[PDB]
Design a protein around this motif. Structure first.
Motif, PDB file in Angstrom:
ATOM      1  N   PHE A   2     -26.013  25.853  57.886  1.00  0.00           N
ATOM      2  CA  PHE A   2     -26.739  25.181  56.810  1.00  0.00           C
ATOM      3  C   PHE A   2     -27.831  26.066  56.217  1.00  0.00           C
ATOM      4  O   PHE A   2     -27.826  26.353  55.016  1.00  0.00           O
ATOM      5  N   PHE A   3     -28.772  26.506  57.050  1.00  0.00           N
ATOM      6  CA  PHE A   3     -29.983  27.144  56.547  1.00  0.00           C
ATOM      7  C   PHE A   3     -29.694  28.527  55.982  1.00  0.00           C
ATOM      8  O   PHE A   3     -29.903  28.781  54.791  1.00  0.00           O
ATOM      9  N   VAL A   4     -29.208  29.437  56.824  1.00  0.00           N
ATOM     10  CA  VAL A   4     -29.066  30.821  56.404  1.00  0.00           C
ATOM     11  C   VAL A   4     -27.906  31.042  55.445  1.00  0.00           C
ATOM     12  O   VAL A   4     -28.065  31.769  54.458  1.00  0.00           O
ATOM     13  N   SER A   5     -26.746  30.440  55.695  1.00  0.00           N
ATOM     14  CA  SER A   5     -25.544  30.744  54.928  1.00  0.00           C
ATOM     15  C   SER A   5     -25.422  29.903  53.660  1.00  0.00           C
ATOM     16  O   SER A   5     -25.364  30.456  52.560  1.00  0.00           O
ATOM     17  N   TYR A   6     -25.377  28.576  53.790  1.00  0.00           N
ATOM     18  CA  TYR A   6     -25.139  27.740  52.618  1.00  0.00           C
ATOM     19  C   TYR A   6     -26.203  27.957  51.554  1.00  0.00           C
ATOM     20  O   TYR A   6     -25.895  28.010  50.358  1.00  0.00           O
ATOM     21  N   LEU A   7     -27.461  28.080  51.968  1.00  0.00           N
ATOM     22  CA  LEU A   7     -28.556  28.275  51.028  1.00  0.00           C
ATOM     23  C   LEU A   7     -28.611  29.691  50.471  1.00  0.00           C
ATOM     24  O   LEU A   7     -29.339  29.928  49.503  1.00  0.00           O
ATOM     25  N   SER A   8     -27.863  30.627  51.053  1.00  0.00           N
ATOM     26  CA  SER A   8     -27.831  32.003  50.587  1.00  0.00           C
ATOM     27  C   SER A   8     -26.837  32.230  49.459  1.00  0.00           C
ATOM     28  O   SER A   8     -26.740  33.356  48.961  1.00  0.00           O
ATOM     29  N   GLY A   9     -26.110  31.199  49.043  1.00  0.00           N
ATOM     30  CA  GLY A   9     -25.129  31.338  47.981  1.00  0.00           C
ATOM     31  C   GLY A   9     -24.205  32.524  48.135  1.00  0.00           C
ATOM     32  O   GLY A   9     -23.933  33.229  47.156  1.00  0.00           O
ATOM     33  N   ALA A  10     -23.710  32.762  49.349  1.00  0.00           N
ATOM     34  CA  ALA A  10     -22.813  33.888  49.586  1.00  0.00           C
ATOM     35  C   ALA A  10     -21.356  33.493  49.379  1.00  0.00           C
ATOM     36  O   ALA A  10     -20.652  34.084  48.552  1.00  0.00           O
ATOM     37  N   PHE A  11     -20.887  32.493  50.124  1.00  0.00           N
ATOM     38  CA  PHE A  11     -19.488  32.089  50.118  1.00  0.00           C
ATOM     39  C   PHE A  11     -19.195  30.990  49.112  1.00  0.00           C
ATOM     40  O   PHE A  11     -18.246  30.222  49.301  1.00  0.00           O
ATOM     41  N   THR A  12     -19.973  30.897  48.040  1.00  0.00           N
ATOM     42  CA  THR A  12     -19.817  29.813  47.085  1.00  0.00           C
ATOM     43  C   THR A  12     -18.835  30.198  45.988  1.00  0.00           C
ATOM     44  O   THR A  12     -18.734  31.366  45.603  1.00  0.00           O
ATOM     45  N   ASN A  13     -18.113  29.204  45.484  1.00  0.00           N
ATOM     46  CA  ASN A  13     -17.074  29.459  44.500  1.00  0.00           C
ATOM     47  C   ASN A  13     -17.673  29.929  43.183  1.00  0.00           C
ATOM     48  O   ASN A  13     -18.780  29.535  42.806  1.00  0.00           O
ATOM     49  N   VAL A  14     -16.922  30.773  42.479  1.00  0.00           N
ATOM     50  CA  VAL A  14     -17.373  31.352  41.222  1.00  0.00           C
ATOM     51  C   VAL A  14     -16.386  31.143  40.082  1.00  0.00           C
ATOM     52  O   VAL A  14     -16.797  31.200  38.912  1.00  0.00           O
ATOM     53  N   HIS A  15     -15.107  30.898  40.366  1.00  0.00           N
ATOM     54  CA  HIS A  15     -14.089  30.742  39.329  1.00  0.00           C
ATOM     55  C   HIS A  15     -13.902  32.038  38.552  1.00  0.00           C
ATOM     56  O   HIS A  15     -13.851  32.049  37.322  1.00  0.00           O
ATOM     57  N   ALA A  16     -13.802  33.141  39.287  1.00  0.00           N
ATOM     58  CA  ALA A  16     -13.589  34.463  38.709  1.00  0.00           C
ATOM     59  C   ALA A  16     -12.754  35.261  39.697  1.00  0.00           C
ATOM     60  O   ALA A  16     -13.254  35.662  40.751  1.00  0.00           O
ATOM     61  N   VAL A  17     -11.485  35.486  39.355  1.00  0.00           N
ATOM     62  CA  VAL A  17     -10.579  36.178  40.267  1.00  0.00           C
ATOM     63  C   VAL A  17     -11.177  37.498  40.721  1.00  0.00           C
ATOM     64  O   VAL A  17     -10.941  37.942  41.850  1.00  0.00           O
ATOM     65  N   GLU A  18     -11.965  38.140  39.860  1.00  0.00           N
ATOM     66  CA  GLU A  18     -12.629  39.394  40.187  1.00  0.00           C
ATOM     67  C   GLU A  18     -13.772  39.223  41.181  1.00  0.00           C
ATOM     68  O   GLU A  18     -13.966  40.081  42.047  1.00  0.00           O
ATOM     69  N   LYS A  19     -14.534  38.134  41.078  1.00  0.00           N
ATOM     70  CA  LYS A  19     -15.784  38.008  41.817  1.00  0.00           C
ATOM     71  C   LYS A  19     -15.714  37.032  42.980  1.00  0.00           C
ATOM     72  O   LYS A  19     -16.590  37.071  43.853  1.00  0.00           O
ATOM     73  N   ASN A  20     -14.707  36.167  43.021  1.00  0.00           N
ATOM     74  CA  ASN A  20     -14.658  35.077  43.982  1.00  0.00           C
ATOM     75  C   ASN A  20     -13.981  35.465  45.288  1.00  0.00           C
ATOM     76  O   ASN A  20     -13.603  34.582  46.063  1.00  0.00           O
ATOM     77  N   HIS A  21     -13.835  36.758  45.557  1.00  0.00           N
ATOM     78  CA  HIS A  21     -13.126  37.209  46.748  1.00  0.00           C
ATOM     79  C   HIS A  21     -13.893  36.964  48.038  1.00  0.00           C
ATOM     80  O   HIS A  21     -13.348  37.238  49.112  1.00  0.00           O
ATOM     81  N   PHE A  22     -15.124  36.468  47.976  1.00  0.00           N
ATOM     82  CA  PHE A  22     -15.817  36.031  49.180  1.00  0.00           C
ATOM     83  C   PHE A  22     -15.552  34.568  49.490  1.00  0.00           C
ATOM     84  O   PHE A  22     -15.958  34.084  50.553  1.00  0.00           O
ATOM     85  N   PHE A  23     -14.884  33.861  48.580  1.00  0.00           N
ATOM     86  CA  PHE A  23     -14.538  32.462  48.789  1.00  0.00           C
ATOM     87  C   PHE A  23     -13.124  32.336  49.334  1.00  0.00           C
ATOM     88  O   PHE A  23     -12.916  31.867  50.461  1.00  0.00           O
ATOM     89  N   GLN A  24     -12.143  32.796  48.554  1.00  0.00           N
ATOM     90  CA  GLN A  24     -10.744  32.741  48.953  1.00  0.00           C
ATOM     91  C   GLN A  24     -10.575  33.107  50.417  1.00  0.00           C
ATOM     92  O   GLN A  24     -10.000  32.344  51.201  1.00  0.00           O
ATOM     93  N   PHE A  25     -11.109  34.264  50.805  1.00  0.00           N
ATOM     94  CA  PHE A  25     -10.978  34.739  52.175  1.00  0.00           C
ATOM     95  C   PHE A  25     -11.283  33.603  53.134  1.00  0.00           C
ATOM     96  O   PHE A  25     -10.386  33.117  53.833  1.00  0.00           O
ATOM     97  N   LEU A  26     -12.526  33.122  53.112  1.00  0.00           N
ATOM     98  CA  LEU A  26     -12.898  32.010  53.974  1.00  0.00           C
ATOM     99  C   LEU A  26     -11.878  30.892  53.849  1.00  0.00           C
ATOM    100  O   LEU A  26     -11.219  30.515  54.825  1.00  0.00           O
ATOM    101  N   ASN A  27     -11.694  30.394  52.626  1.00  0.00           N
ATOM    102  CA  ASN A  27     -10.719  29.346  52.375  1.00  0.00           C
ATOM    103  C   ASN A  27      -9.435  29.643  53.127  1.00  0.00           C
ATOM    104  O   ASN A  27      -9.016  28.876  54.003  1.00  0.00           O
ATOM    105  N   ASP A  28      -8.829  30.790  52.825  1.00  0.00           N
ATOM    106  CA  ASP A  28      -7.571  31.142  53.462  1.00  0.00           C
ATOM    107  C   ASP A  28      -7.664  30.970  54.968  1.00  0.00           C
ATOM    108  O   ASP A  28      -6.936  30.165  55.559  1.00  0.00           O
ATOM    109  N   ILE A  29      -8.594  31.688  55.601  1.00  0.00           N
ATOM    110  CA  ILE A  29      -8.708  31.627  57.056  1.00  0.00           C
ATOM    111  C   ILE A  29      -8.765  30.179  57.509  1.00  0.00           C
ATOM    112  O   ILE A  29      -8.034  29.759  58.414  1.00  0.00           O
ATOM    113  N   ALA A  30      -9.607  29.383  56.855  1.00  0.00           N
ATOM    114  CA  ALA A  30      -9.761  27.994  57.262  1.00  0.00           C
ATOM    115  C   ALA A  30      -8.468  27.227  57.036  1.00  0.00           C
ATOM    116  O   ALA A  30      -7.991  26.515  57.927  1.00  0.00           O
ATOM    117  N   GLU A  31      -7.874  27.375  55.852  1.00  0.00           N
ATOM    118  CA  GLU A  31      -6.583  26.755  55.591  1.00  0.00           C
ATOM    119  C   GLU A  31      -5.544  27.160  56.625  1.00  0.00           C
ATOM    120  O   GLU A  31      -4.547  26.451  56.799  1.00  0.00           O
TER     121      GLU A  31
END
Lengths: 283, 278, 277, 279, 282
Positions: A137-166
């Motif tokens: 909650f504190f360090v990660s979610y509030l750091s806006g690191a793994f948040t979605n961007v809707h940009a195939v170029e820039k959102n590669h920190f989201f998909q990864f997580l998503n994929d692993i979790a999926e």
């Protein structure tokens, strides 16, 4: 002149005895100290997991994938992650996965009574969960690191997580159980490694190889999976609580306990139970 | 014949407490030089790592791997700073927080000495970093804009890292600094407990590497990166540097060194420092 | 323990620096020459490597990153040899013998004799390993075909850069170099173990190299051999523009920025340690 | 100041080898079997991990450039930790035992039946553990399934290729590859017996294992794991190719490497000084 | 807490070397022959491993983008394990023991006859071991066979290139490259002899031999193994181009490096310090 030799290795009876004593000491702590140690351990796990995920997402880039898939990212993820157990052990911390083997071995030897076993296990599990979800909650979610961007170029920190979790929310009971069995086998060895090398060079690299194999292999951990799935729930990644708490975490938990006490605890007690006697009579 | 090198928990806690304690008999003038030297080391490793990363930031490589090898090699290169800082007796803020604050909690130091050690070390780190940025990095012309697109892989990298450090929000930089300083305090705890030489290198290596490749903000490295990105006329404003990046990362690093690791540690081990004296 | 740091290190260093003057003259010369040819050896190696990775089609994607990376990875082995054999290298000793001078453990004439002889021997060794090994091997010669010439272009593409740098540039880069090397010697004499030696010198040298910092001894070798194989440089550019500023910067760093402060930091400890017995 | 020599020479590694081998046959028939099963478990686990790595590095498109290059490298980078787990856990591997106990016998510390007792218990337990881990983990996980699509099927395809190449050799080739393998293995055992350091224990074995892995050498226990699991996941191989064509030659070669190539020369060099030692 | 330091460099590292080079000459002919043969076996083994690695990386499509960089890189990453074998199992290697035996001679601890004897035994054993491994393991295993198909032949072509580069050299070239090789390996021997700690041996020798191998210098044993296996699998070379154009120059250069370039200054520098060792010994 000729130097003098140093014995930087001692295995067999020594290591098993060290582990049983370790498990014995965990008894005459108090509830608050174990709580805190466990929470710190969870915090460390979560931090190294954040770092490893960011590495992976860097190497999980829009175009690398069209050629290479998820190899480089899982590799660096595995490469980054083992620092945690070094922190944990050399800080004076308590990990639920690491305590299965040692404390059930101390139980088998009729030193730690049962109520102690249960309260220690429960507190360690609870504290690890607390640490991991808190750091999520504190360090990660509030750091806006793994948040979605809707940009195939820039959102590669989201998909990864998503994929692993999926990935972790489609297996069946047996699959997750066996993978967690393998995980805990490795980490118990990793713990055995840190109670046996007795030097700086040995600890780091043995634990490193153990945990890297664990990660690159694709196995499961109740403390790592908690972090990953909770934070993925914080971002609105395509998973729910059903798919996470009810499906995956219980398999991993049971698999870890099995691989800790049965797969590796009963054999080791059977083999060495007769040399742990000649060390208790003497003193 | 036989004895174990590594020692965790109790011994390491006493060690860190005494290490924080000994920063208060140095007559106000060794601390300043030690701090400035640690800052120089930071800026030196940062220059080296920025070159390393601008190498793998080439025009065509960006398209494929997109800023991966750059960050990786930067992280691989940066750590030696901590080894040279520790092996030289220097003083660093991000690592002084933990020790001096643990010593404080135990009533072996007063608020006066604590505050002035903090201030002296912060100022010395600033001095060293900016001085190295001026003498070596700006006059060396290593980070000069060569408008051609083939040879400008050293400038862009910087422009495209600092530009990131300056378009965060408050909470984000605070959290990232918390993470960084946790890693750093932990590297220091290692270097105090392992006392071998092998882990003395590799533990610190892995810790600082995770710090860098994770995306966390460090107060000193920030000073260097942002000052030298100002000297070279990047697209960052001096307001976006001191009031968006240094204040929050400073607060976060202090948080992490002081209450996250320090308080629980002093709480788990309070009892066993009360026995060593006797 | 196998590491102390801070106080005992300063003392180890000034003693190591003080024993350089009881040595005979020729012995010191031989050590310097050995060190020079060690440097030339490791430089030949790193160069063949970076040339392997400076390939025709690989350049058009990555440029020059892989080559410089492998260079920095391979070079960090000479100084281990210099230290273990009992040698004496100029850049490494700038700091060591200047500190012995500060504490009034060494005179001026002897300190300067040490410096002159060590510089001379380093030059001798570098040029000797250049001629007798690198140039007669026919390893860096030109072939007039972009498929095989990646071992010469690399050279033509590196000594065409150390040359065109201006004065202040070369001075600052030499400062960075000699700072790294001073720290490397400090470590290798204060970290008492093999892992420590190797892995505290390796990272320092890899950083020095990957960073583009210039060393007096390494650039001697590179520019000599670049002259032999008929690259696109000249003796003027090779000696005036690159070597004198590099020397000045290395000395400035090893002897002022690094040794002048710590001397003041750790003075009373050496003083009383010499009053001990 | 203190003088330290954490290493030792060849005169005492041989003695430690002899003593280790000598001790090995003094155990019960029960704990020996358990140690063997545990070593096989370790081996199968690390083989699973390494194969998943190598397959991860075996994508459709990465094959059309580098073929099978990176996969073997990562496989051999991951494989070594097995021997660390084994030795530090007190367990015994059959290949390691082939050289360790043959020497105990040559010195006439052991007799002709305990040698075979130990060899057979070790091989049986290794096979048990390998096949068991192949079933409970690698077949109950759907990791090496034939998903039948060239995106993910790589995880299976790799195994298919590796397995297929392994079973198509002639009798004289596998015996030689096995020779090389067991040479490296017994030499890593020698290492961990003599050097007496964590850095040593780890890296001296890392390099040797990476070597006999990436060289294409054949190991007797590894092969039990990957051939038995291959039968399970329904590769394009057969039990005949899996047992009569690989395991018999591999075993013969591993043995004539451990007990002849390295065992006899060493016993000639260092036997006299063992007589010096005893008294 | 007590202090411990393992490496006593410089002076000591000379004394040991001398004694080392002397022990080889108190041995017997059977012992030393077996030792050299085992060292040859180890060299051939590690060279086979390294060639397989490099050819695995020398794939048809990878070359068109990279040439031969990753090949040589992994070759040098893989080869530095023969040295630890030889060191820990107690064998007599040629390029290594040349410096020690010299130092023992210069210091008048060994005779000329014994020197020649030890050197011949060592070289003969190396040749035997390496050819035996190149036939019984590497040639029968069909590893380096020609298939005449580019998708698969990348373990053969690699070899066909290495040799076809080692036999279009001239005399002075090979002599200097051998000088370099030996200046590296003798130095590696010095490291393990003087480090006296775990990581020291392994990583010192690893870096030294990796640089040697990536450098392109030639070592007398490895070239034996390589040229002989190439002759076995029928590359484009012959025996004239093997022993007349590569092995004589290589042995010459290696011996020069061992006993002249290196060592001789190590006798001059320290000759006295050896004399500093006996009189106080008793």
């Amino acid at each position: 002149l000729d130097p003098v030799s140093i014995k930087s290795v001692c295995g067999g009876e020594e290591s098993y005895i060290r582990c049983v004593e370790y498990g014995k000491k965990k008894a005459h702590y108090s509830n608050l100290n174990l709580l805190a140690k466990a929470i710190l351990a969870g915090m460390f796990v979560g931090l190294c997991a954040h770092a490893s995920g960011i590495a992976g997402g860097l190497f999980y880039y829009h175009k690398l994938r069209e050629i290479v898939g998820a190899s480089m990212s899982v590799f660096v993820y595995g490469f980054t992650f083992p620092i945690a157990f070094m922190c944990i052990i050399c800080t004076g911390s308590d990990l639920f996965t690491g305590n299965t083997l040692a404390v059930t071995m101390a139980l088998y030897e009729k030193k730690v009574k049962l109520l102690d076993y249960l309260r220690v296990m429960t507190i360690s599990l609870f504290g690890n969960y607390v640490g991991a979800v808190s750091f999520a909650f504190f360090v990660s979610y509030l750091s806006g690191a793994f948040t979605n961007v809707h940009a195939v170029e820039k959102n590669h920190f989201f998909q990864f997580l998503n994929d692993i979790a999926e990935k972790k929310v489609h297996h069946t009971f047996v699959e997750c159980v066996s993978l967690a069995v393998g995980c805990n086998i490795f980490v118990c060895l990793a713990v055995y490694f840190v109670l046996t090398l007795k030097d700086g060079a040995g600890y780091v690299f043995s634990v490193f190889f153990a945990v890297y194999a664990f990660a690159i292999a694709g196995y499961e951990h109740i403390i790592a999976n908690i972090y990953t799935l909770n934070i993925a729930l914080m971002v609105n990644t395509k998973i729910t609580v059903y798919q996470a708490y009810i499906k995956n975490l219980l398999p991993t938990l049971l698999g870890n306990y099995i691989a800790g006490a049965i797969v590796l605890g009963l054999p080791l007690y059977f083999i060495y139970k007769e040399h742990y006697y000649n060390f208790e009579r003497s003193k």
